[PDB]
Design a protein around this ligand. Structure first.
Ligand SMILES: [Cl-]
Ligand SMILES: [Mg+2]
Ligand SMILES: [Mg+2]
Ligand SMILES: [Mg+2]
Ligand SMILES: [Mg+2]
Lengths: 244, 196, 241, 250, 226, 231, 204, 195, 243
């Protein structure tokens, strides 16, 4: 019958590894690099679009940076379509929590929920896992500014600075070198762009090949503002930091 | 409602008044209560207008699908499909239907399906609120193997009396003739049948 | 090589099970043809009764789907009857729900959608049949719409199906290149049937008796099949000029 | 019976490739060329009507389809897959939007719904991916004119102008030289016809080319008068004659 | 509510009053009771107002999808069949009483629909609390072979009868004309015979008349930059 | 070979190997004999032990007062099929006040076994059954195979070395069919029949199992010292 | 027993020249017992305002439901919902509970950010839309409000004049209803400024 | 059950609840504690139909304790009250609704403020300086409206509470067998064992 | 290759090999036939006597559906019983809704669609039987034969099993020598002869003959088994012809 054609997506190898998870991670290593850096006064998200065209409408385009709510955003590395499925689920979870408790969802609770959904696809159902790794940038009043990552296995971890996608080994070494704990957002903006500039597989880093976002308490008094940078604003910050 | 169907030498004729009522208000004075479920299988409807329309639409669908697979259905088969719907949904329906049809093998046939969902094959049948007033007249005046003209007169005279005494009945007398020759519609106006 | 057993893509972007279903289509070794008149649509098909023990009246590949729609099938009879029963059920349901007779092109689309599903869902196999639907539509007039195992469908001025479809197709193409019109300019359906049989004889190069053919005719408000004696009358008229 | 294929038929290979999606993209590459160009006051989408037989009536086969009054779609790849996707796209525009908000969805969100359906055929049990790439053009009040491409994986991208299928690589180069941000709709139609001529072998006329626009509101195509705020559909399919008129000024 | 439908030479016309009530109170004085199912199929509703609007939009939505699927302009009999089967299934609980009219490739049509699923055919029909007042006018002035101008006149006269004589009806007359081979023309507020007279007095208050405890600016803007 | 992975696959010669492998389990089972006259029907079964400390596996199961069977093969499968027979006998009595005909009981067993040979996921039953009974048409003996094939016989045997008992019954056919109104002589013939299938071992008091049903005899099973009389 | 008059309360909305106003009382009760004088019945999602009267548990539930839905709307659409669109969403949401409805009387008010046009609308418990040019009323003193608005209202009132008109309409209506009062709030809404004023009124 | 009162003062919330349990003819118990601790700084009292009261209270308690363990964090009183409201608002359209009215007294450690929430079985929530359920408010609110100040001490709150209970014992027909009084503040929850 | 390992898979020829393998099981079975006569049909089957211990006349093979249809089959006997059980359900539901007993052509398609459905999926196995069936309805006598593929046609005479070629040749002679038709009683005699003649392919073991019929004049359009004197008369006629 049908057993003949079953790939068995949820089995261990003789070494105790999950085949499909490992192969999904291999897929993600070819995606555009995304970087997150956490500072005392905010968080930076920077990400590289994959080899674009001059005829791509950039100002209406979004493939890397997504808003989950007013306090939490994500950077994507992997299959964009797979990511949007999970992103919509996460947006709903955040609203469910807000309706139930009348408080914005703490960052880790949202991250754990999405990560558990990924885990399920590795243990039951016989379906392929989601080929997506996330960087979560967010703020709540318990832990303040937070950075997390999750991958197709459903495992998640917290970070001061982290990269996903292509050339993570090189990127993580560069971040580990220049990152300091007392760093500020404006300094973190520069570090993120400098790191992408050195790790990129392109010839030069230009505004049309980037997506950029900041989460600042640089919002008038005790509140948090998300800023998804416009194409002209990415062009200006590239000149300011002296990359173009 | 005053409805009836009568078998005769050449086939069968269905008859009906044209009154639909919500209380004492005549919501439609020119209603068509003679309904086609197949080319030469028609029915007369009495009871809830919603129910009998819903049933007749389903039967027409069933017989259309029967025809595509097995050819022309018998009048008995059409009556059985009506019965199945009326019996199995007796708790939720208020429908009294008379089924009349013409085969070439069986000729004219009449089946009556009262409230309970039972079936009764008869030489002729009467139903509706107005039928109560013509049980005596119809029993005395019906003969088997009448001519077309005699049967038209029998139905015209019978429904004339039903209309005369039943406030729920009225308007025009509609008729549908079912024979080997085809399908003929007849209509008779008040000025004609009131002077009978 | 399990991409050849179920309906998933091969490395060339092909569906082999669909392609092999097209091959099953010619297993009966029967050719069919359809043309349009002014007021009618005619479909003819070869009839072969190889066993003397068979009842020849029960051997048929033309189906009366509804009062207005007829369907001829190219492919094995089990799959043909499967498609026939479904088409009959779909046509009846349509009339019940929407209050008017299902158009020929709409039924074709519906059966084509069902076929498309078999090419995408693994547990269902394609049906090894090509379905030619004919009618005289109340809006579009004479109509020919044909469906295949890939889920493709389109309208036709005229069409042909079977092992020798190309010969019949080219023969029909050449006629319409001369006349420069989209139909057979003829009043009666009898003469349109005569045109259909004549041009099949020309294309295949074979003569036909009354038992070698099968004919279906669609007019306004009914589709019907001809008897052997009706076909004989048609063959006599062809021979007498 | 029962569908006993409850497992994925698309899986990751050791190299991280999703084979069935790649093979679906290969099927799209074999498909007939279709393109889209965005102007300041409109959008144009076009393709070739590759007729399978001259006895076939190619007007009965619609490659360019209306999804909403202000949104249209064209494809390259497997035709039957496109036809069912158009059915699903039309329905989802109503069920998941119009029956909720009392208005038609904006271009980007309808594209998002179609993309979701295509993604699920890439992960759900016992199914293969759709073998098509779509180009969807549309207009809405707050986003203006827009053009999107949707692939078998479910991924979608916005374009100023693009092409998919057979001769897409050459066509995209041709469009890069001609496109600017000051084009009027008539200029975009002219460029579309020039671009499409390169990938067409045989006859090139109004009967072999299918072309539609998203432009001004057409009150003449509304079907009723009396409501000032209802001004008619922005989607309009060009006639055979209208195409031929612009082929003389070519 | 008063709603009518009248057949004429080359089409059909429907009309309605513009009063919607909550018991004895008038909720809206200029209500729109003429609903569009499709460009050339319009219906007027009496009974539960939400039900008539909802059932019209559901069937109107499905009719649009059907039209796209079949590549054909929608038919009135399709709208009728879909409406009645939906209403029968809900056993009268969906309180929608409709007059359905329109033109299609088959011709011009006029039907009515009761909430429990029963339908009827006619040349002239009326529904709602003012249906008896309207039907009196229709039974007095209707004839065969009416012109467009005569049918509009008869329909609006029948609505007026409802406006003036039925307490459930009032205000203005809305009309929609559906002629074969033409665009349907929706004539909103075709008649306006109930404008309120000028009041005897202006009730504009001097500024500072109302006692206030606290004032504050409400932040409707999103969280700001910098 | 390539066509024995499941029950849903025919071989190129039209064979169903999973069903044939299920048939093989019966041949490994212990011998059991069935025979009848016109008044009575008898089952004789050689029970098998695991070792000298173990009990002898029971072979005969009662289904109703007028019906019962003996098994050879997978014992749990016999429990499933005998339970189904108990239910069907019971349904007939409760609903129709009617004792289930032995022939109709065979038809029900055939159809239940068939469904497991045409569907994916399942497996055939791995047991053979000999059903005896006395109904309105007298004594009956049936043989059930898990292929679905059910056969009515005067006598038969299934299990290992069953061919010896089957030949003996084929010789004695004319004698034992005439043993009417004498239960002891009919059992003697059955004990003599099963003896033609023994090697190395002989019939002992905890080895032998006998069952009988007849005109005025409810289905009863004899074990232990109750069969010493026949040793 | 009647769910729509257990808790009490009222809402009224009006249009003016390039502005709209919406106002409500502050009472929540358990029939005769006054429970709270701080139960506000007007909420806002971006620049769109929603007042809700009726059963208080449903008032709270629906606010939470529309906050939920307008937040997801904004994330997907990348813009704030408009009054015309939100009105349809309220209608849809209420009708989905046709045979087990929320016992409420919602009122929408706002200015379209693109056209600048003032907009108001009202609903019954089951979703039917009342889109009046002049005014909308709701609650246990809706009769009283209809009487006040019908005489006090005139078109094209300036923002500060409209404040006086709507305030007097609410106050005097509430004083003729046992289950309304205990404070009041008025919102004056212009294209890019909204002022909120609490009114002084009798506390019986 | 019968009488449940609540009052929010400067630095604490005080809940008072009757001790009687009556099953129709007889008073079966005179020492019943109609309260459950949901978290270290949140207390919930309850009254309504027999059985449903304790079943609902313990169900809520279990859920909040589960949240506390999962996140290693105590939810704010506002967040707990919203969770409780939603459960009751869900319940009112169920097959058989919970016939339970509650008061939630909590001290918010983040804002350093006491908070009192009143929620009825329909899911009607209000934040109040003082509250009650049933007929309790009819007797006590006129006294609380007169004497209450937002800057009251805990001792002044207990004295105002005694005056309320005395008025209940005078004018109520039922003998509710006194009240158990509990205080919720920055240090947690404690019971006043002499009242 | 591998196209023959799973049901419903098209080979590169456009063939379903699993269905073709089911035919092999049919060809392995005993011979069964059907003869269409003037006002009815006759069915006959070869029953191999494997042993003396088989009770004569007891293991009945031919099956009745409703009261007017007879069914006989060659191949896997249990598969045939499963098909007849479905046929009995189909006939019962038809008569329930439409009152009249199911017409033979209608009944034929019901079996046909059900057998064809077992060629659409790999989760089921095709039927290992060819079934000869028929009876009398309002339009007269009908004889059908249904294959594992779901294919069926109407027949003047039909045969299947191990001795089908021999039987077919005998049936073809009857069609040629009787264009006017055959009587019911003649058809019973001829059926006995054809089974005896077809037993040459199974000559190792002796056999038992079993015949049934539905005739408008002889059985009132009801299906009945041929018994006693009429059966012995047919056996004698058959034995006389082989000698
Ligand atoms: Cl479809
Ligand atoms: Mg009268
Ligand atoms: Mg498939
Ligand atoms: Mg008051
Ligand atoms: Mg008072």
């Amino acid at each position: 019958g049908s057993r003949r054609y079953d790939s068995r997506t949820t089995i261990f190898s003789p070494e105790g590894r999950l085949y499909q998870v490992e192969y999904a991670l291999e897929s993600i290593s070819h995606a555009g690099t995304a970087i997150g850096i956490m500072a005392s006064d905010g968080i930076v998200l920077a990400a590289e679009r994959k080899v674009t065209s001059t005829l791509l409408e950039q100002d209406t385009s979004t493939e890397k940076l997504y808003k989950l709510n007013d306090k939490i955003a994500v950077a994507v590395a992997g299959l964009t379509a797979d990511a949007e499925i999970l992103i919509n689920t996460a947006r709903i979870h955040a609203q469910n929590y807000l309706k139930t408790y009348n408080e914005d969802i703490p960052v880790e609770i949202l991250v754990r929920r999405l990560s558990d959904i990924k885990q399920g696809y590795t243990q039951h159902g016989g379906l392929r896992p989601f080929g997506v790794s996330f960087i979560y940038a967010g703020y709540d009043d318990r832990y303040g500014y937070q950075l997390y990552t999750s991958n197709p296995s459903g495992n998640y971890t917290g970070w001061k600075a982290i990269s996903v996608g292509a050339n993570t080994s090189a990127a993580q070494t560069l971040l580990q070198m220049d990152y300091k704990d007392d760093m500020k957002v404006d300094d973190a903006i520069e570090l993120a762009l400098k790191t992408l500039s050195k790790t990129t597989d392109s010839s030069a880093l230009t505004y049309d090949r980037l997506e950029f976002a900041t989460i600042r308490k640089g919002a008038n008094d005790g509140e948090v503002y998300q800023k998804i940078f416009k194409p002209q604003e990415i062009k200006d910050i590239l000149v300011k930091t002296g990359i173009t | 409602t005053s409805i009836m169907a009568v078998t005769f030498k050449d086939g069968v004729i269905l008859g009906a008044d044209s009154r639909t009522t919500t209380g004492a208000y005549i919501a439609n004075r020119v209603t068509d209560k003679l309904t086609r479920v197949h080319d030469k299988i028609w029915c007369c409807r009495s009871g809830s207008a919603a129910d009998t329309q819903a049933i007749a639409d389903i039967v027409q669908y069933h017989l259309e699908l029967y025809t595509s697979q097995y050819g022309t259905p018998s009048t008995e088969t059409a009556a059985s499909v009506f019965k199945e719907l009326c019996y199995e949904n007796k708790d939720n329906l208020t429908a009294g239907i008379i089924v009349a049809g013409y085969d070439d093998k069986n000729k004219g046939e009449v089946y009556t399906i009262p409230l309970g969902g039972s079936v009764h094959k008869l030489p002729y049948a009467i139903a509706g609120s107005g039928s109560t007033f013509i049980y005596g007249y119809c029993d005395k005046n019906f003969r088997e193997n009448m001519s077309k003209e005699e049967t038209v007169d029998f139905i015209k005279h019978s429904l004339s009396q039903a209309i005369k005494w039943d406030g729920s009945s009225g308007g025009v007398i509609r008729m549908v003739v079912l024979t080997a020759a085809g399908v003929e519609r007849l209509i008779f106006y008040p000025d004609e049948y009131e002077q009978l | 090589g399990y991409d050849r057993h179920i309906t998933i893509f091969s490395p060339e972007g092909r569906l082999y099970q669909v392609e092999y279903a097209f091959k099953a289509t010619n297993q009966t070794n029967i050719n069919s043809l359809a043309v349009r008149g002014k007021d009618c649509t005619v479909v003819i098909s070869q009839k072969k009764v190889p066993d003397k023990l068979l009842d020849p009246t029960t051997v048929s590949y033309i189906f009366c789907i509804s009062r207005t729609i007829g369907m001829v099938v190219n492919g094995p009879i089990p799959d043909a009857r499967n498609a026939a029963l479904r088409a009959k059920a779909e046509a009846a349901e349509f009339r019940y729900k929407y209050g008017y007779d299902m158009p020929c092109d709409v039924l074709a689309k519906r059966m084509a959608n069902l076929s498309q599903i078999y090419t995408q869902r693994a547990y269902m196999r394609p049906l090894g049949v090509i379905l030619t639907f004919v009618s005289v539509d109340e809006e579009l007039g004479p109509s020919i719409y044909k469906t295949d195992p890939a889920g493709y469908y389109v309208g036709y001025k005229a069409t042909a199906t079977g092992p020798k479809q190309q010969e019949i197709t080219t023969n029909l193409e050449n006629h319409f290149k001369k006349s420069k019109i989209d139909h057979i300019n003829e009043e009666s359906w009898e003469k349109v049937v005569e045109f259909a049989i004549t041009h099949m004889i020309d294309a295949l190069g074979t003569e036909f008796s009354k038992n070698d053919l099968e004919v279906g005719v669609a007019t306004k408000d009914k589709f019907f099949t001809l008897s052997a004696e009706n076909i004989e009358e048609r063959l006599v008229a062809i021979a007498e000029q | 019976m029962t569908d006993r294929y409850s497992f994925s038929l698309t899986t990751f290979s050791p190299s991280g490739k999703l084979g069935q999606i790649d093979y679906a993209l290969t099927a799209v590459k074999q498909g007939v060329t279709s393109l889209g160009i965005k102007a300041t006051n409109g959008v144009v989408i076009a393709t070739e009507k590759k007729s399978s037989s001259p006895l076939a009536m190619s007007e009965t086969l619609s490659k360019v389809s209306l999804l909403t009054p202000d949104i249209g779609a064209v494809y390259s790849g497997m035709g039957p897959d496109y036809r069912v996707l158009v059915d699903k796209s039309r329905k989802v525009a109503h069920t998941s939007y119009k029956r909720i908000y009392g208005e038609y969805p904006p271009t980007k969100l309808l594209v998002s719904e179609v993309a979701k359906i295509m993604q699920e055929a890439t992960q759900s049990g016992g199914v293969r991916p759709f073998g098509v790439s779509l180009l969807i053009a549309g207009h809405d009040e707050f986003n203006g004119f827009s053009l999107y491409q949707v692939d078998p994986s479910g991924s979608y991208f916005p374009w100023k102008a693009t092409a998919i299928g057979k001769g897409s690589v050459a066509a995209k180069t041709f469009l890069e030289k001609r496109w600017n941000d000051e084009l009027e709709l008539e200029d975009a139609i002219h460029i579309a016809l020039l671009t499409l001529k390169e990938s067409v072998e045989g006859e090139f006329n109004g009967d072999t080319i299918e072309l539609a626009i998203i432009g001004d509101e057409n009150p003449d195509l509304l079907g009723y008068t009396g409501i000032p705020t209802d001004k008619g559909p922005r989607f309009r399919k060009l006639t055979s004659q209208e195409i031929n008129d612009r082929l003389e000024a070519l | 509510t008063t709603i009518v439908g009248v057949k004429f030479n080359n089409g059909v016309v429907i009309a309605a009053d513009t009063r919607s009530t909550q018991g004895p109170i008038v909720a809206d004085k200029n209500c729109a009771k003429l609903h569009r199912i499709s460009p050339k199929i319009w219906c007027a509703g009496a009974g539960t107002a939400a039900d008539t609007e909802a059932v019209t939009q559901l069937i109107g939505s499905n009719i649009e999808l059907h039209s796209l699927y079949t590549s054909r302009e929608p038919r009135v009999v399709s709208a009728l069949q879909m409406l009645k089967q939906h209403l029968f299934k809900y056993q009268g609980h969906i309180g929608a009483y409709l007059i359905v009219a329109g033109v299609d490739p088959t011709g011009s049509h006029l039907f009515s629909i009761h909430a429990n699923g029963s339908t009827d055919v006619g040349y002239y029909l009326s529904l709602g609390s003012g249906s008896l007042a309207a039907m009196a006018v229709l039974e007095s002035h209707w004839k065969q072979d009416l012109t467009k101008e005569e049918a509009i006149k008869l329909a609006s006269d029948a609505i007026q009868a409802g406006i003036w004589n039925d307490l459930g009806s009032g205000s203005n007359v809305d009309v929609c004309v559906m002629e074969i081979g033409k665009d349907a023309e929706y004539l909103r507020n075709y008649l306006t015979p109930n404008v309120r007279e000028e009041k005897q007095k202006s009730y504009k208050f001097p500024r500072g008349t109302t006692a206030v405890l606290k004032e504050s600016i409400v932040n409707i803007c999103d969280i700001q930059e910098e | 070979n390539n066509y024995d992975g499941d029950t849903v696959t025919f071989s190129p010669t039209g064979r169903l190997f999973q069903v044939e492998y299920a048939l093989e389990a019966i041949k490994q089972g212990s011998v059991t004999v069935g025979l009848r006259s016109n008044t009575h029907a008898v089952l004789v079964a050689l029970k098998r032990n695991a070792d000298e400390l173990s009990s002898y596996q029971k072979k005969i199961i009662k289904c109703d007062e007028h019906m019962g069977l003996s098994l050879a093969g997978l014992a749990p499968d016999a429990r499933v099929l005998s339970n189904y027979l108990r239910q069907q006998c019971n349904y007939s009595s409760l609903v129709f006040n009617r004792k289930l005909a032995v022939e109709r009981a065979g038809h029900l067993l055939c159809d239940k076994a068939q469904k497991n040979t045409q569907s994916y996921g399942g497996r055939p039953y791995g047991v053979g059954l000999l059903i005896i009974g006395y109904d309105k048409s007298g004594a009956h003996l049936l043989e059930f195979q898990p292929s679905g094939n059910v056969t009515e016989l005067y006598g038969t045997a299934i299990g290992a070395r069953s061919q010896g008992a089957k030949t003996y019954l084929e010789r004695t056919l004319d004698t034992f069919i005439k043993i009417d109104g004498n239960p002891d002589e009919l059992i003697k013939a059955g004990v003599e029949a099963i003896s033609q299938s023994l090697r190395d071992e002989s019939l002992t008091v905890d080895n032998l199992s006998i069952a009988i049903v007849g005109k005025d005899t409810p289905f009863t099973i004899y074990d232990g010292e109750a069969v010493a009389k026949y040793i | 027993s009647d769910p729509s008059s257990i808790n009490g309360g009222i809402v009224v909305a009006m249009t003016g020249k390039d502005c709209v106003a919406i106002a409500c009382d502050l009472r929540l009760g358990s029939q005769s017992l006054g429970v709270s004088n701080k139960f506000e019945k007007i909420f806002h999602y971006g620049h769109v305002f929603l007042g809700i009267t009726g059963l208080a548990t449903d008032v709270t539930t629906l606010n939470e439901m529309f906050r939920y839905k307008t937040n997801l709307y904004k994330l997907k659409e990348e813009r704030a919902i408009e009054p015309e669109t939100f009105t349809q969403l309220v209608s849809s949401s209420l009708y989905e509970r046709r045979f087990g409805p929320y016992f409420v009387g919602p009122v929408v008010a706002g200015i379209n950010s693109k056209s600048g046009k003032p907009f108001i609308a009202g609903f019954d418990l089951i979703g039917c839309i009342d889109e009046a040019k002049d005014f909308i009323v709701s609650g246990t003193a809706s009769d009283q409000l209809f009487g006040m608005c019908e005489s006090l209202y005139e078109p094209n009132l300036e923002p500060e004049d409209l404040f006086e008109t709507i305030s007097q309409a609410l106050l005097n209506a509430a004083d003729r209803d046992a289950l309304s009062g205990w404070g009041a709030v008025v919102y004056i809404i212009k294209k890019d400024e909204v002022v909120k004023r609490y009114l002084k009124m009798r506390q019986d | 059950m019968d009488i449940i009162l609540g009052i929010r003062v400067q630095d604490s919330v005080i809940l008072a609840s009757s001790k009687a349990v009556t099953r129709g003819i007889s008073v079966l118990k005179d020492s019943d504690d109609k309260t459950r601790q949901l978290s270290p700084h949140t207390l919930m009292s309850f009254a309504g139909e027999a059985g449903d009261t304790v079943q609902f209270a313990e169900y809520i308690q279990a859920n909040i304790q589960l949240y506390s363990i999962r996140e290693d964090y105590e939810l704010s009183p506002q967040a707990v009250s919203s969770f409780v409201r939603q459960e009751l608002a869900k319940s009112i359209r169920s097959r058989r609704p919970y016939q339970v009215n509650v008061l939630i007294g909590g001290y918010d450690k983040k804002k350093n403020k006491p908070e009192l929430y009143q929620i009825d079985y329909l899911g009607t929530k209000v934040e109040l300086p003082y509250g009650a359920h049933g007929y309790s408010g009819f007797y006590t609110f006129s006294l609380l409206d007169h004497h209450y100040r937002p800057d009251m001490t805990t001792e002044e709150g207990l004295d105002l509470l005694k005056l309320c209970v005395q008025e209940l014992e005078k004018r109520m027909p039922m003998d509710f067998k006194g009240v158990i009084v509990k205080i919720v503040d920055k240090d947690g929850i404690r019971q006043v064992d002499d009242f | 290759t591998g196209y023959d390992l799973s049901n419903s898979v098209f080979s590169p020829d456009g063939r379903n090999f699993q269905v073709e393998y089911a035919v092999k099981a049919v060809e392995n079975g005993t011979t069964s036939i059907g003869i269409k006569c003037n006002d009815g049909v006759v069915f006959a089957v070869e029953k191999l006597i494997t042993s003396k211990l088989l009770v004569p006349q007891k293991n009945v093979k031919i099956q009745v559906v409703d009261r007017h249809i007879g069914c006989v089959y060659s191949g896997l006997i249990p598969d045939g019983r499963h098909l007849v059980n479905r046929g009995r359900e189909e006939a019962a539901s038809f008569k329930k809704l439409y009152k009249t007993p199911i017409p033979i052509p209608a009944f034929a398609d019901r079996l046909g669609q059900y057998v064809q459905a077992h060629t659409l999926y790999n989760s089921v196995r095709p039927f290992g039987v060819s079934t000869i069936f028929g009876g009398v309805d309002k339009n007269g006598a009908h004889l059908y034969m249904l294959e594992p593929s779901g294919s069926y046609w109407g027949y003047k005479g039909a045969a299947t099993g191990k001795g089908r070629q021999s039987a077919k040749a005998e049936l073809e002679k009857l069609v040629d020598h009787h264009p006017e038709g055959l009587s019911a009683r003649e058809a019973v005699k001829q059926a006995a002869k054809i089974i005896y003649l077809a037993h040459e392919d199974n000559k190792e073991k002796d056999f038992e003959l079993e015949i049934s019929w539905c005739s408008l004049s002889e059985t009132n359009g009801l299906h009945k088994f041929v018994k006693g004197d009429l059966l012995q008369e047919a056996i004698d006629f058959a034995q006389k012809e082989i000698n």
